[PDB]
């Protein structure tokens, strides 16, 4: 039951199952994983593919020789398993050089280095088959108000993203970029803190069609925001290039729980939306098996990610397929929401006395929305109580 | 000391000093204010102007005759005082008809009525001199996931804003629109929940140049976001058409405290930014004198709004004018942030060995940002301790 | 399926289904309910009982004559239905006189009036069968730091609660008091903001055995706290006299959604705890049918409260009864948690070399907690996926 | 100006200025500090004393020989400088063995080891002069609901604290214990999450007089709580044995900014309260110089902690000493708050017709609290604008 297969397009970062358990207040609880072993164990679990930071796959400061050997080993594991690599990203946050940012570090030479580090890994990503290249500006921001001129920082952020878009255009690459928003941590406030801010920023770039968002469940929830709503707006803009799935219990540090944990009802409505809208990108899990777990718990946690997606997928499908739910949706006028407000046009609206002068405001106010009955049908399906 | 004058461009909504003190758990503590008295008392305090909802100025359901009388009284008060009306807005939230929204109500006839209600008040706003027309979609959203198809809702929201833009274009009006974001309350989640989401949505409108944001201090803070950062991004996009100033203590219900209360340091950095960037729009206070206050406390609270702006203005000016602060800004490389990252171009960057192969990553990592010394200079100025 | 009966001990406040829908930004969407009709409709739904504020049952400012008539009507409805009244409370928040508090108002005469208002309703509560009298100090607090000396306020709060305890002792009443904590709203910060603060305060009262807590799901979640954990600590202290069940989506205004909505997984673990610990008090729903709903939606929402409790009750029971879950609990050493740490005593511990000098810290560190596998068993049961 | 001296009782943890800058997403940006150098540099800055975890002073796993040498070096630095050690604590969180807790780990042998680790360091603390021994149960809690039986966990927590109290009683030590609450991080939820929960738990211990709280500014703010209010309640209970001062910007990860940053107005009201109540314990800074800083920034940040306390101390003193503020406090009836509500007694209250039957509720409701004018006087003083 609920066994994942590659058609489900489930993917995992090397850094997820490979997280050793170091947190602000504690040392590693698990040994480091060989990327080759992760590719194999994930393939056995039914995953579609893997993702990586440059520094997950090639240890930082590697010579050309060692770099080659790490990449060759990895590609062989991908060949043995048929695992794909739909997305890759740059580590612009771990090394102390990035303590004030990469693309928006106050130090100009760091910003140039950030771009060269990213461009090198774009080449490798394209070679391995990645269709999306993710930017998470985890270090772009400040802890204090005077440390960062944010208009200048956004100048530098636009400049970097424009340069990356000129680079892929000059190479004839098909890869597109996806910004992964996060409101805070490790910086006190991070630039482009939500899906909305990232989408707005993209529209000021030179080639906006090359850039979308990679929203993460837990990150929008760290701002108390409704993650299905933000995904809906990303889909509405045509910008949902990729997505990070995990769990988060409210407004606190970034938990990265396995998907399904945290806000379970939001996970249900998210899966309902992704499936209904026909999202066809990777279902990527950016999660961390809690450091309480040994290696067997790591793989159980990763399996649980896919399992919870597939259960929720079945619950939302049954919900939508239920005639009683279809009738409830009509009773709540979800169908009227889809009708143009005034396709008859502005002048017809202005002359339409039934829209104002003769609008019976009180009869319309008295019509109950029947939202609670519909939500309890949704709850009944989610819990299997139908 | 710190006495406001009309050149300071301080404005107040009729609904602010006129808030009677009804909250979810209690009845009104103050009698209703005559708009004419508010215009006069505000003018005596040194305010530049007033704003209004349609239903603040004309009681809902007013005949043409009574409407005329309410407007004539109001204009006379504006003539006696020289008070301006730089902004107006529509009440699309109080009446029970709007319980599921205005522009995005599931009921199509409510959406049409919403638009006719707004268009009527745009005409009056333009007549009274308003340069900005604000939309706060306080009822646009949901408490439960199935109640609102958010992609369809954004269709309807775009349709309404496009119709309003066609209307002002057809009338030859100069007025522009500003979306006021709010993440939640009174709906469980509100559509376009932050400055970022509103800015992104604007770029999908037919005439994006007609639309900006009216961000509110407390609303971005209800999402835990950095309000000066969001204002910076609005300024960066050229979209800061208007601004709502008040106070908010963290993530909870919308407090609307007088400006300066709540997050005092954020208020300092906000005033520093507005003044430094040369923002020239109204400094509008969307606040509520707490219901603990009688009428004398109402006017003291409103005076306190302007007073705190002017103190903070002086502190930020002294901060920026301090040679020790100018030197600290250089020590933190705020000037390098303003320099293009790679004006020499992509190819020069790719061939620049000092940007990667020969970049001494560790020497750069060892350079301290000196952010704490700069922030303590900012703290010293804010507190008058220099 | 999942039909509630009076043995389930489900109770509702008159103010819950009777909420007319007035919120900070909107007028009532529903007509007022006759308390007699609420008693009957709730009895038909399978509820065990009702609760009330004094001013829900007798309109404020009622003469003795009218008061008598309102009470007689109500008791007759209770006689016709067999509905019980296990809890009552005082409205010390709606009337403008309480704008700075009841028991801790700065004005001494208001504090005395608060106590007389409460004592009058204790008499009625005792007559109607109430075993618990709830205090919600919704107005006790401040919006600004200088407005309330909090040590003096706690003096006054202790004085009032001591006086109430002397009153019930002098009358020979069996009724006990329960403090309902709330962190904020309508005050900027409310005194005794969480279960913990309320429990600590009780231990300074003259007769601590007369006082417990009435924790509310949404209120602890408004502080981002774990509601099952706080309930566990209340049970551990022997102080869970009563409980308020509802839903809340994170840190924002007090939503009072129907129970089961909001944090669904927390609702599961709460029901699991209440049932496992053998809590036998009322399962009281302090919720508000959203103002989008008409009267049919009001009763559907109230039914949904009980329904979700009973589904979750069945899921947690099946979870606990599962042999695979019992084995998982042993694998995670939940049984070792129940064993005394050092029943051999301090001196034996000090001389036990296996507890320090010879403790193999690394072998113990390597033992995985197997928490993820256990939680995925819990998730499987909650969703019906076993 | 604002130069700290030892009479100000400012203290710092070795782990504060000694924080190397490793965070969840990045490596250390600073070399490790020798505790002897920290003692000296802090003494030069005007600090009163230092605190430590066992593992800050003696590296984990040290032989008796090396342990002795580390302690001797440290005591010599304390002798050269006259620096005191008013508080010490145990590291029960860094080592992987504590991944599920110390005192409440599910594994019984870990709980015993936790206690032996703590008891060893109590001996050293007492020797060095510590009057308070702090327990921060950072690992006590869970990420998932089934992992921790919280009633059993509180049993184990009581058992451990009782054993520690029996140990100090058996040794004739004067040292007292202080629980440092934290709501979350590194566990998803931490047991005893706030000051209130810790105070309540203490009252169930065998010897409650031996236990108080060590509240931290940022930790209560991570729950959105009012830190001055919680301190007031701790003072009211007689339990403010110690205090941790720092800065935090709202509900997010534990920032540990230098004191004064974060919520500046809350810092003002906190200093006002501590000074007014005559708190005489250490003013301890549990903060982390941001990892953006080099060693010079570390000492500037630490100096800034004391500096901001002393500025705020002067502002609050001037506020309280202002005749205009004294008059405002009377206008807001802060003096009436201090008067007993009903020292005439219950029966006199019951027979007092002026407290109910003849209480003019509307005249009392119409009396404005004048809170805004008082708060603007407080704001004026804080900003130096008087
Ligand atoms: O850079 C991309 C990735 O970096 C990871 O280390 C972070 O945990 C993620 O937020 C992000 O998806
Ligand atoms: O509609 C515009 C205005 O409506 C007011 O009632 C709300 O309080 C504000 O958020 C908003 O500025
Ligand atoms: O006074 C007791 C009750 O008052 C109600 O109006 C509030 O909504 C509840 O928080 C509380 O249970
Ligand atoms: O154990 C006591 C101390 O441990 C430190 O590592 C934590 O940062 C503090 O929260 C605490 O004061
Ligand atoms: Mg991610
Ligand atoms: Mg506003
Ligand atoms: Mg309640
Ligand atoms: Mg601490
Ligand atoms: Mn994350
Ligand atoms: Mn607001
Ligand atoms: Mn509530
Ligand atoms: Mn901390």
Tab-separated table of N, CA, C and O in Angstrom, chain B residues 107-187:
chain	number	residue	atom	x	y	z
B	107	UNK	N	-19.871	34.792	-4.627
B	107	UNK	CA	-21.092	35.231	-5.286
B	107	UNK	C	-20.759	36.322	-6.291
B	107	UNK	O	-20.245	37.383	-5.916
B	108	UNK	N	-21.067	36.054	-7.566
B	108	UNK	CA	-20.750	36.992	-8.636
B	108	UNK	C	-21.454	38.327	-8.447
B	108	UNK	O	-20.874	39.384	-8.730
B	109	UNK	N	-22.711	38.310	-7.996
B	109	UNK	CA	-23.410	39.583	-7.860
B	109	UNK	C	-22.781	40.463	-6.777
B	109	UNK	O	-22.773	41.697	-6.914
B	110	UNK	N	-22.202	39.862	-5.729
B	110	UNK	CA	-21.475	40.655	-4.735
B	110	UNK	C	-20.237	41.290	-5.358
B	110	UNK	O	-19.913	42.451	-5.076
B	111	UNK	N	-19.515	40.541	-6.197
B	111	UNK	CA	-18.328	41.100	-6.841
B	111	UNK	C	-18.681	42.308	-7.701
B	111	UNK	O	-17.960	43.315	-7.693
B	112	UNK	N	-19.788	42.229	-8.447
B	112	UNK	CA	-20.222	43.365	-9.254
B	112	UNK	C	-20.580	44.556	-8.374
B	112	UNK	O	-20.253	45.701	-8.705
B	113	UNK	N	-21.260	44.298	-7.252
B	113	UNK	CA	-21.633	45.362	-6.327
B	113	UNK	C	-20.399	46.011	-5.710
B	113	UNK	O	-20.310	47.241	-5.627
B	114	UNK	N	-19.436	45.189	-5.272
B	114	UNK	CA	-18.149	45.693	-4.806
B	114	UNK	C	-17.567	46.706	-5.787
B	114	UNK	O	-17.181	47.811	-5.396
B	115	UNK	N	-17.521	46.354	-7.077
B	115	UNK	CA	-16.921	47.255	-8.061
B	115	UNK	C	-17.716	48.548	-8.208
B	115	UNK	O	-17.131	49.633	-8.308
B	116	UNK	N	-19.048	48.460	-8.219
B	116	UNK	CA	-19.855	49.677	-8.329
B	116	UNK	C	-19.693	50.564	-7.097
B	116	UNK	O	-19.640	51.797	-7.211
B	117	UNK	N	-19.609	49.957	-5.911
B	117	UNK	CA	-19.356	50.725	-4.692
B	117	UNK	C	-18.017	51.453	-4.764
B	117	UNK	O	-17.911	52.618	-4.353
B	118	UNK	N	-16.980	50.775	-5.268
B	118	UNK	CA	-15.656	51.383	-5.356
B	118	UNK	C	-15.628	52.508	-6.392
B	118	UNK	O	-15.025	53.561	-6.162
B	119	UNK	N	-16.265	52.293	-7.543
B	119	UNK	CA	-16.222	53.267	-8.633
B	119	UNK	C	-16.912	54.562	-8.220
B	119	UNK	O	-16.429	55.664	-8.516
B	120	UNK	N	-18.039	54.453	-7.513
B	120	UNK	CA	-18.710	55.647	-7.008
B	120	UNK	C	-17.775	56.494	-6.146
B	120	UNK	O	-17.728	57.727	-6.279
B	121	UNK	N	-17.009	55.850	-5.268
B	121	UNK	CA	-16.144	56.600	-4.368
B	121	UNK	C	-14.865	57.083	-5.042
B	121	UNK	O	-14.294	58.087	-4.599
B	122	UNK	N	-14.408	56.412	-6.101
B	122	UNK	CA	-13.300	56.956	-6.883
B	122	UNK	C	-13.666	58.336	-7.419
B	122	UNK	O	-12.858	59.270	-7.363
B	123	UNK	N	-14.899	58.489	-7.929
B	123	UNK	CA	-15.338	59.785	-8.452
B	123	UNK	C	-15.215	60.867	-7.391
B	123	UNK	O	-14.698	61.961	-7.653
B	124	UNK	N	-15.691	60.574	-6.180
B	124	UNK	CA	-15.627	61.545	-5.094
B	124	UNK	C	-14.188	61.830	-4.683
B	124	UNK	O	-13.807	62.994	-4.492
B	125	UNK	N	-13.385	60.770	-4.521
B	125	UNK	CA	-11.961	60.922	-4.225
B	125	UNK	C	-11.284	61.861	-5.211
B	125	UNK	O	-10.580	62.795	-4.813
B	126	UNK	N	-11.456	61.605	-6.510
B	126	UNK	CA	-10.834	62.470	-7.504
B	126	UNK	C	-11.285	63.914	-7.309
B	126	UNK	O	-10.471	64.845	-7.374
B	127	UNK	N	-12.575	64.121	-7.025
B	127	UNK	CA	-13.088	65.480	-6.851
B	127	UNK	C	-12.407	66.184	-5.686
B	127	UNK	O	-12.051	67.366	-5.785
B	128	UNK	N	-12.201	65.469	-4.581
B	128	UNK	CA	-11.617	66.048	-3.378
B	128	UNK	C	-10.101	66.184	-3.435
B	128	UNK	O	-9.508	66.690	-2.475
B	129	UNK	N	-9.447	65.750	-4.502
B	129	UNK	CA	-8.014	65.943	-4.616
B	129	UNK	C	-7.139	64.737	-4.359
B	129	UNK	O	-5.906	64.881	-4.358
B	130	UNK	N	-7.723	63.554	-4.162
B	130	UNK	CA	-6.934	62.372	-3.832
B	130	UNK	C	-6.041	61.974	-4.996
B	130	UNK	O	-6.496	61.867	-6.139
B	131	UNK	N	-4.766	61.740	-4.699
B	131	UNK	CA	-3.829	61.231	-5.690
B	131	UNK	C	-3.692	59.715	-5.657
B	131	UNK	O	-3.213	59.130	-6.632
B	132	UNK	N	-4.105	59.073	-4.567
B	132	UNK	CA	-4.006	57.631	-4.410
B	132	UNK	C	-5.355	57.084	-3.977
B	132	UNK	O	-6.021	57.666	-3.118
B	133	UNK	N	-5.764	55.965	-4.566
B	133	UNK	CA	-6.958	55.269	-4.116
B	133	UNK	C	-6.535	53.900	-3.591
B	133	UNK	O	-5.950	53.104	-4.329
B	134	UNK	N	-6.831	53.624	-2.317
B	134	UNK	CA	-6.321	52.425	-1.651
B	134	UNK	C	-7.358	51.314	-1.715
B	134	UNK	O	-8.562	51.544	-1.512
B	135	UNK	N	-6.887	50.106	-2.010
B	135	UNK	CA	-7.664	48.883	-1.877
B	135	UNK	C	-7.053	48.030	-0.769
B	135	UNK	O	-5.882	47.638	-0.859
B	136	UNK	N	-7.840	47.763	0.274
B	136	UNK	CA	-7.507	46.796	1.315
B	136	UNK	C	-8.517	45.668	1.196
B	136	UNK	O	-9.678	45.832	1.583
B	137	UNK	N	-8.084	44.531	0.657
B	137	UNK	CA	-8.983	43.397	0.538
B	137	UNK	C	-9.084	42.588	1.815
B	137	UNK	O	-8.730	41.405	1.839
B	138	UNK	N	-9.576	43.216	2.884
B	138	UNK	CA	-9.641	42.572	4.185
B	138	UNK	C	-10.506	41.329	4.237
B	138	UNK	O	-10.265	40.452	5.081
B	139	UNK	N	-11.507	41.225	3.365
B	139	UNK	CA	-12.387	40.066	3.353
B	139	UNK	C	-12.028	39.056	2.276
B	139	UNK	O	-12.724	38.042	2.150
B	140	UNK	N	-10.965	39.291	1.504
B	140	UNK	CA	-10.612	38.394	0.409
B	140	UNK	C	-9.764	37.274	0.984
B	140	UNK	O	-8.615	37.495	1.380
B	141	UNK	N	-10.322	36.080	1.051
B	141	UNK	CA	-9.564	34.979	1.633
B	141	UNK	C	-10.500	33.880	2.108
B	141	UNK	O	-11.563	33.661	1.528
B	142	UNK	N	-10.089	33.216	3.187
B	142	UNK	CA	-10.804	32.029	3.642
B	142	UNK	C	-10.385	31.676	5.059
B	142	UNK	O	-9.304	32.046	5.521
B	143	UNK	N	-11.247	30.904	5.727
B	143	UNK	CA	-10.870	30.243	6.964
B	143	UNK	C	-10.579	28.765	6.764
B	143	UNK	O	-9.959	28.151	7.642
B	144	UNK	N	-11.007	28.191	5.639
B	144	UNK	CA	-10.854	26.768	5.363
B	144	UNK	C	-10.426	26.588	3.911
B	144	UNK	O	-10.729	27.420	3.045
B	145	UNK	N	-9.728	25.480	3.646
B	145	UNK	CA	-8.999	25.352	2.389
B	145	UNK	C	-9.874	25.193	1.161
B	145	UNK	O	-9.503	25.643	0.071
B	146	UNK	N	-11.035	24.555	1.310
B	146	UNK	CA	-11.920	24.297	0.192
B	146	UNK	C	-12.834	25.440	-0.182
B	146	UNK	O	-13.470	25.392	-1.237
B	147	UNK	N	-12.880	26.486	0.640
B	147	UNK	CA	-13.847	27.558	0.460
B	147	UNK	C	-13.487	28.499	-0.685
B	147	UNK	O	-14.365	29.199	-1.209
B	148	UNK	N	-12.224	28.525	-1.095
B	148	UNK	CA	-11.737	29.536	-2.020
B	148	UNK	C	-10.755	28.867	-2.966
B	148	UNK	O	-9.715	28.370	-2.528
B	149	UNK	N	-11.098	28.811	-4.251
B	149	UNK	CA	-10.124	28.439	-5.268
B	149	UNK	C	-9.252	29.656	-5.496
B	149	UNK	O	-9.716	30.653	-6.064
B	150	UNK	N	-7.993	29.589	-5.052
B	150	UNK	CA	-7.215	30.820	-4.998
B	150	UNK	C	-6.771	31.265	-6.393
B	150	UNK	O	-6.673	32.471	-6.652
B	151	UNK	N	-6.540	30.334	-7.331
B	151	UNK	CA	-6.243	30.766	-8.701
B	151	UNK	C	-7.439	31.481	-9.328
B	151	UNK	O	-7.275	32.523	-9.977
B	152	UNK	N	-8.651	30.942	-9.144
B	152	UNK	CA	-9.846	31.645	-9.617
B	152	UNK	C	-10.030	32.971	-8.892
B	152	UNK	O	-10.401	33.981	-9.511
B	153	UNK	N	-9.794	32.992	-7.577
B	153	UNK	CA	-9.900	34.250	-6.843
B	153	UNK	C	-8.935	35.295	-7.399
B	153	UNK	O	-9.297	36.463	-7.553
B	154	UNK	N	-7.710	34.891	-7.732
B	154	UNK	CA	-6.778	35.862	-8.299
B	154	UNK	C	-7.204	36.300	-9.700
B	154	UNK	O	-6.952	37.448	-10.087
B	155	UNK	N	-7.816	35.401	-10.483
B	155	UNK	CA	-8.471	35.816	-11.724
B	155	UNK	C	-9.457	36.948	-11.467
B	155	UNK	O	-9.392	38.009	-12.105
B	156	UNK	N	-10.370	36.744	-10.512
B	156	UNK	CA	-11.359	37.767	-10.191
B	156	UNK	C	-10.715	39.030	-9.644
B	156	UNK	O	-11.207	40.137	-9.885
B	157	UNK	N	-9.634	38.889	-8.878
B	157	UNK	CA	-8.987	40.083	-8.347
B	157	UNK	C	-8.331	40.873	-9.470
B	157	UNK	O	-8.427	42.103	-9.507
B	158	UNK	N	-7.685	40.181	-10.410
B	158	UNK	CA	-7.115	40.864	-11.564
B	158	UNK	C	-8.213	41.521	-12.389
B	158	UNK	O	-8.082	42.675	-12.814
B	159	UNK	N	-9.305	40.796	-12.621
B	159	UNK	CA	-10.397	41.353	-13.405
B	159	UNK	C	-10.917	42.646	-12.784
B	159	UNK	O	-11.121	43.644	-13.482
B	160	UNK	N	-11.120	42.658	-11.465
B	160	UNK	CA	-11.625	43.872	-10.824
B	160	UNK	C	-10.624	45.019	-10.947
B	160	UNK	O	-10.990	46.140	-11.326
B	161	UNK	N	-9.349	44.760	-10.644
B	161	UNK	CA	-8.368	45.844	-10.708
B	161	UNK	C	-8.176	46.344	-12.131
B	161	UNK	O	-7.960	47.547	-12.337
B	162	UNK	N	-8.255	45.442	-13.118
B	162	UNK	CA	-8.206	45.865	-14.514
B	162	UNK	C	-9.405	46.753	-14.859
B	162	UNK	O	-9.255	47.778	-15.538
B	163	UNK	N	-10.596	46.390	-14.376
B	163	UNK	CA	-11.779	47.208	-14.642
B	163	UNK	C	-11.642	48.594	-14.022
B	163	UNK	O	-12.025	49.597	-14.636
B	164	UNK	N	-11.103	48.674	-12.802
B	164	UNK	CA	-10.893	49.976	-12.177
B	164	UNK	C	-9.875	50.804	-12.959
B	164	UNK	O	-10.019	52.028	-13.089
B	165	UNK	N	-8.839	50.156	-13.492
B	165	UNK	CA	-7.859	50.876	-14.285
B	165	UNK	C	-8.414	51.338	-15.618
B	165	UNK	O	-8.028	52.394	-16.129
B	166	UNK	N	-9.322	50.559	-16.202
B	166	UNK	CA	-10.000	51.003	-17.416
B	166	UNK	C	-10.934	52.166	-17.115
B	166	UNK	O	-11.088	53.085	-17.935
B	167	UNK	N	-11.546	52.155	-15.933
B	167	UNK	CA	-12.447	53.236	-15.569
B	167	UNK	C	-11.700	54.558	-15.403
B	167	UNK	O	-12.140	55.585	-15.930
B	168	UNK	N	-10.578	54.567	-14.667
B	168	UNK	CA	-9.864	55.834	-14.478
B	168	UNK	C	-9.233	56.295	-15.780
B	168	UNK	O	-9.137	57.503	-16.037
B	169	UNK	N	-8.784	55.358	-16.615
B	169	UNK	CA	-8.266	55.724	-17.929
B	169	UNK	C	-9.362	56.347	-18.792
B	169	UNK	O	-9.128	57.343	-19.485
B	170	UNK	N	-10.574	55.786	-18.743
B	170	UNK	CA	-11.664	56.318	-19.553
B	170	UNK	C	-12.122	57.684	-19.059
B	170	UNK	O	-12.646	58.476	-19.846
B	171	UNK	N	-11.959	57.974	-17.771
B	171	UNK	CA	-12.336	59.273	-17.228
B	171	UNK	C	-11.223	60.310	-17.313
B	171	UNK	O	-11.445	61.464	-16.935
B	172	UNK	N	-10.038	59.939	-17.787
B	172	UNK	CA	-8.921	60.869	-17.763
B	172	UNK	C	-8.423	61.256	-16.384
B	172	UNK	O	-7.783	62.303	-16.244
B	173	UNK	N	-8.687	60.438	-15.362
B	173	UNK	CA	-8.237	60.702	-13.996
B	173	UNK	C	-6.741	60.441	-13.835
B	173	UNK	O	-6.183	59.521	-14.439
B	174	UNK	N	-6.094	61.242	-12.983
B	174	UNK	CA	-4.690	61.039	-12.637
B	174	UNK	C	-4.487	60.103	-11.452
B	174	UNK	O	-3.343	59.727	-11.166
B	175	UNK	N	-5.558	59.735	-10.755
B	175	UNK	CA	-5.434	58.945	-9.537
B	175	UNK	C	-4.815	57.584	-9.851
B	175	UNK	O	-5.049	56.995	-10.915
B	176	UNK	N	-3.974	57.104	-8.939
B	176	UNK	CA	-3.370	55.781	-9.008
B	176	UNK	C	-3.872	54.939	-7.839
B	176	UNK	O	-4.344	55.463	-6.829
B	177	UNK	N	-3.759	53.620	-7.979
B	177	UNK	CA	-4.235	52.687	-6.965
B	177	UNK	C	-3.071	52.150	-6.136
B	177	UNK	O	-1.962	51.975	-6.641
B	178	UNK	N	-3.336	51.858	-4.862
B	178	UNK	CA	-2.339	51.251	-3.981
B	178	UNK	C	-2.986	50.116	-3.199
B	178	UNK	O	-3.986	50.322	-2.506
B	179	UNK	N	-2.432	48.919	-3.328
B	179	UNK	CA	-2.923	47.771	-2.574
B	179	UNK	C	-2.313	47.803	-1.179
B	179	UNK	O	-1.095	47.952	-1.023
B	180	UNK	N	-3.160	47.667	-0.158
B	180	UNK	CA	-2.662	47.598	1.206
B	180	UNK	C	-2.651	46.145	1.666
B	180	UNK	O	-3.721	45.580	1.944
B	181	UNK	N	-1.496	45.497	1.765
B	181	UNK	CA	-1.477	44.075	2.130
B	181	UNK	C	-1.738	43.868	3.606
B	181	UNK	O	-1.423	44.716	4.449
B	182	UNK	N	-2.283	42.691	3.917
B	182	UNK	CA	-2.466	42.254	5.280
B	182	UNK	C	-2.482	40.725	5.244
B	182	UNK	O	-3.137	40.151	4.362
B	183	UNK	N	-1.766	40.039	6.143
B	183	UNK	CA	-1.662	38.576	6.025
B	183	UNK	C	-2.903	37.846	6.521
B	183	UNK	O	-3.224	36.772	6.007
B	184	UNK	N	-3.604	38.411	7.500
B	184	UNK	CA	-4.772	37.761	8.088
B	184	UNK	C	-5.529	38.805	8.895
B	184	UNK	O	-5.033	39.910	9.136
B	185	UNK	N	-6.731	38.423	9.325
B	185	UNK	CA	-7.672	39.155	10.172
B	185	UNK	C	-8.325	40.277	9.369
B	185	UNK	O	-7.666	41.257	9.018
B	186	UNK	N	-9.633	40.211	9.130
B	186	UNK	CA	-10.589	39.289	9.752
B	186	UNK	C	-10.663	37.911	9.085
B	186	UNK	O	-11.243	37.015	9.687
B	187	UNK	N	-10.124	37.663	7.894
B	187	UNK	CA	-10.145	36.303	7.362
B	187	UNK	C	-8.979	35.500	7.938
B	187	UNK	O	-7.940	36.054	8.317
